[PDB]
Amino acid sequence: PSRLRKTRKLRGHVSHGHGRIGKHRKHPGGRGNAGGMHHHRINFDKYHPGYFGKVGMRHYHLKRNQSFCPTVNLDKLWTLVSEQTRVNAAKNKTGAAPIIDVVRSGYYKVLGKGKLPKQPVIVKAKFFSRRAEEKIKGVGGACVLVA
Amino acid sequence: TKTWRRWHRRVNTTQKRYAICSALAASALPALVMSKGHRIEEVPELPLVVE
């Protein structure tokens, strides 16, 4: 609110908090990003490196659906399915392993980052990382690819 | 003054329910109701439930 702003305590001071030698003029340094190459060179090089110039190829008609591929990690892999699935699989004596369809959850690619608990799984995903697959194989499990 | 001043403010629903829950809880404390100023001295009990 304007009650608590600084302008309420600036009344009585001639310059209104803007200086007496250099008055608060309209646009002493140009409009917007003016003179980035000329008189704002130091600021645009000390704080915006790479700002000037092009790089890379140009993709004219880019559609995000083609490149849409959310990823999940093995630490969160068990979080997708309910707790009772994991506890029953751990208690299970016949060696049956739960099947985790990460696609139904909404992740296409599985990346292996965290520690995977010692428990057989069947991860049914769309893509797999090399380390993710070898962790699943090492802990004991299967990887199923779906389209 | 322009018509498109930000008249309306939105609040999170969790704290919306927080406030009314606190209001109801405070409504059962005789000190906080007399502090509000309602004449409640001879009321049989503050959580006034009727048939």
């Binding site: - | 969790t14 329910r17 927080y18 829950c21 109801l24």
Partner: protein
């Protein structure tokens, strides 16, 4: 009211997912807390001699 805002151990039956906000402190009686043997025993001697 209990079905609206839920109990401490029972969530609200009419809201999608809501429960009463937990207290930051339970025993709010500060005087009773201070005037207990457990705290008073582990205290230093007072110094009320104004110099």
């Amino acid at each position: 009211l209990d079905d609206l805002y839920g109990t401490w151990r029972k969530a609200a039956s009419l809201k999608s997912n809501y429960n009463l906000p937990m207290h930051k402190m339970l025993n709010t009686d500060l005087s009773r807390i201070l005037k207990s043997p457990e705290i008073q025993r582990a205290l230093r001697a007072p110094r009320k001699k104004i110099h």
